[PDB]
Structures are given as C-alpha cells and as structure tokens.
C-alpha cells in the first residue's frame, strides 16, 4: 500500500497549483484520500478528504473557497487544486489514507509530500560539485567527502550515495537560501581513509522541478 | 474547532530515560456509547511524513515498539516512551478525529541528552569544476558533535570575514545523538584568486581552545 505524489512545483502568487497522488497496493475506491499540508516549522493542517469511490468531498473552512479535490478511479489517482496562491501557501502538501480503522485491519499511509513554493523566482536545477577527500579532509583514519549541490530552486533536492548502498555516516544538510534567490546544500559522508583507492563514491542528486538526475563521482 | 494543545514543546532526557508528552483537547473526545477516545499519536522525523503510533488514544499500531504507550480519556491524554532510544528523536503530534475539521497538536520535539563530543573538522577547497564556472565555495564541515552550540569563523589571508558565509545544522543523529554543521564561504573566482590562506576556526565546548583548519589556494 503506497501513495506516490507528483513532484515539487513553483507557482506565482495568484496562480493555481494541482498536485497528484497515485495510489497502489489496494482497491482505490475503498477508502477516502485526505490532503494535509505542513508549512516549514508549522504544524499539520488538514484541508479536506475525497471518497475515492463516490467522489464526495469535505473541505476545511480555510480552503473551501480555493481548493478542489477530485479523483480518477481508472487512474487510481486523487488530485488537489489550490487556487489564488499566497506566500502563506508555501508548504509540503501530503495526501494520506489517514487512520483507516476497519473491523479487521488498521493502518495509516502517507504520500512522500509535494513541496509547493509560491514565488516569482526563477526555476534552476543544481550544479553538483565534488567535495573530494584530501589531506585537509581527514580526521585520523576517517576521510570526509561529499557533494556541493549549489544554485537550485525550488526546494527540495534529494541526495543518496552509491544508489542507496551507502547510508552510514551520511549527513545531508538543510538547504540555505543565497542572496541570489537560489538554494545550496552539501551532502557529506565519512569513510575509512585506508579504502580511498579501492572504493567508489557517487552522490545521486534528484531535483524533481528540473528533472535533475545527476550522478557525480567523488574521487580523491 | 478542536484545539489540540501539547506540552512541553520540547523534551530532552538521556538514553533509556522515560519521556512524557501531554495532549489536551479543547473539547471532550470520549464517546460513552463505545467507550472510545478519538485520538491518535504520530511520530515525524525530518524529511518523512508522520508515522502513526497510537490510535483510539491507546491502541498501538502493529509493529510499533511496546515502549510507546498512550493513556488518558476525555480531554487529557498522555504519550509515554518508557525507555527512550536514540532512534526515537522526532517530533510527536497528537491528532483528533472526533469532529471536523480534523486537527493536530503543535508537536513535541524529543531530543537525547548525551555526553560532550568535540567536532571533527574538515575543510574542502573549491573544486576545479566549480572554479571553471567562475564561483568559489569553501566548505567547512563540523562532524558529529554535542551539544549543538558551536561557532565557526572564516579567516582569509588571516582577516576575519563577515557576510559571505552561511551555515546549516542537521537534526540530532538517530544513532549517536550528535549534530553536524556545514559552513560555506562563497566568493567570486576573482576574489578567491586574490588570497592565499583560507581557514575556518571552530569553537565548541568540547574544545579547550579554537581549532583552525586551513589550506593555501
């Protein structure tokens, strides 16, 4: 049972946004899809639900005038459309099968979230630069290396190492907005220094708004 | 609407210590007809959606460790972690599904108190790839330290820099309960080429004096 959401988007203030939510692993018409949003640092805000079978909806008072929730049973997808966007609408938008409590089963499943940024700023995939291990990046027997993921907009980017085989000691830092209006972050990992000549380290950077799938080898 | 008020806003106890989170609803969420409270507890780690832990105020979701338990009835609810584990660092939310609109509490952030750990400091010069673009970023990494407070200053040809660097700090690590910090100095390529010595100077409680990591361009 999974919910897979569309990628992050930037929309200008006053425009509209539509976020999709593809359901798999169950019979789509059986349950209600909820939409919940989470502003950066603020709490979870419920927006509405749609019955995936009959298409009936209930909207929160805050969003009734500008939200529309729909579904396509054949495509097993629910949609949320928010209109007249304001900066205050910048948030992560989740679809969720909230508290499914039935006679013989209880579960609760969320999509991964879709970051919607309300802004007139430029869209940009990142430039991915290696942070190579060197004599300046050793703490004794460990070596630090990483990738600088620079000059992108909007959030988010995701970073993995070696397509997910390398996770221990990985730190992907929160993004920081530069004065240019673009974000930058670094992702770093510590590895044995004795192993730098035999192992390969690749950072895998994804930026959905620009369809960025960059694999950058980081060599000593 | 049903306001969900959590207390405290943040909580820090040692590994294996018991943690208590309170949730009060602005109206009664108990139904005498089925003797149920319409309350759920969620766990959220950074980057991920919330995870259901408890529903009906005290029924654990399958797979949830038994060290999580919910109690209370009516308006006053409690989430207890009987022996905190390092992976339990997260923000915890209560949730009511008694009435519309569905609402959530403000969240309670749970941290681990652990011993002092001095940062391991690494420095990265600009890559050749970036330099051919015309911009130069120097990255200073403070790895796996505790507590969170640290100071990083940048010196270029021994002169303290101001206004050309930014920092980021991770959430507490789910395994060793430490923090890490990145500080990036950004210069145009031409200004980077005007100087020889680049250094980041690190102050932290685990260090008796500042540590400086340096390189020459």
């Amino acid at each position: 049972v999974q919910l897979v959401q569309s990628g992050a988007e930037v929309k200008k203030p006053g425009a509209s946004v539509k976020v999709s939510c593809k359901a798999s692993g169950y019979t789509f018409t059986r349950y209600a899809i909820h939409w919940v949003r989470q502003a950066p640092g603020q709490r979870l805000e419920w927006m509405g639900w749609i019955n995936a079978g009959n298409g009936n909806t209930r909207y929160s008072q805050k969003f009734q005038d500008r939200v529309t929730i729909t579904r396509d049973t054949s495509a097993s997808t629910a949609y949320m459309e928010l209109s007249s966007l304001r900066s205050e609408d910048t948030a992560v938008y989740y679809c969720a099968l909230l508290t499914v409590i039935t006679p013989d089963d209880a579960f609760d499943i969320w999509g991964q979230g879709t970051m919607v940024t309300v802004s007139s700023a430029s869209t940009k995939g990142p430039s991915v630069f290696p942070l190579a291990p060197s004599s300046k990046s050793t703490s004794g027997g460990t070596a630090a290396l990483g990738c600088l993921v620079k000059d992108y907009f909007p959030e988010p980017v995701t970073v993995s190492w070696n397509s997910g085989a390398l996770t221990s000691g990985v730190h992907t830092f929160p993004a920081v907005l530069q004065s240019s209006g673009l974000y930058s972050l670094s992702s770093v990992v510590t590895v044995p220094s004795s192993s730098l000549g035999t192992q390969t380290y690749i950072c895998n950077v994804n930026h959905k708004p620009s369809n960025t799938k960059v694999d950058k080898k980081v060599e000593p | 609407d049903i306001v969900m008020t959590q207390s405290p806003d943040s909580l820090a106890v040692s590994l294996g210590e018991r943690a208590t989170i309170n949730c009060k609803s602005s109206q009664n969420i108990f139904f005498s007809s089925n003797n149920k409270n319409y309350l759920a507890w969620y766990q959220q780690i950074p980057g991920q959606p919330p995870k259901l832990l408890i529903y009906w105020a005290s029924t654990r979701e399958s797979g949830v460790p038994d060290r999580f338990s919910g109690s209370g009835s009516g308006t006053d609810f409690t989430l207890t972690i009987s022996s905190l584990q390092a992976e339990d660092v997260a923000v915890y939310y209560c949730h009511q599904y008694y009435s519309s609109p569905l609402t959530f509490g403000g969240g309670t952030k749970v941290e681990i108190q652990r011993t002092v750990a001095a940062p391991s400091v690494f420095i990265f010069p600009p890559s050749d790839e970036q330099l051919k673009s015309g911009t130069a970023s120097v990255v200073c990494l403070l790895n796996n330290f505790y507590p969170r407070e640290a100071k990083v200053q940048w010196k270029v040809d021994n002169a303290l820099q101001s206004g050309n660097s930014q920092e980021s700090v991770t959430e507490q690590d789910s395994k060793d309960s430490t923090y890490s910090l990145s500080s990036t100095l950004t210069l145009s390529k031409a200004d980077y080429e005007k100087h020889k010595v680049y250094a980041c100077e690190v102050t932290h409680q685990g260090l008796s004096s500042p540590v400086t990591k340096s390189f020459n361009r």
Binding site: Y31, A32, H34, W49, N51, R58, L97, L98, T99, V100, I101, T102, P103, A106 | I29, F31, S33, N34, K36, Y38, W56, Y97, Y98, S99, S100, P101, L102
Partner: peptide
C-alpha cells in the same frame, strides 16, 4: 458526539 464523517476511514464500531 463524534461526527462519523470527520474521517470516513474510521469505523467507530471497530474496537
């Protein structure tokens, strides 16, 4: 009393 349409996914009789 609870509103059973606050969340249609909740069966109130399921204990």
């Amino acid at each position: 009393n609870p509103d059973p349409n606050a969340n249609p996914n909740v069966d109130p009789n399921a204990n």
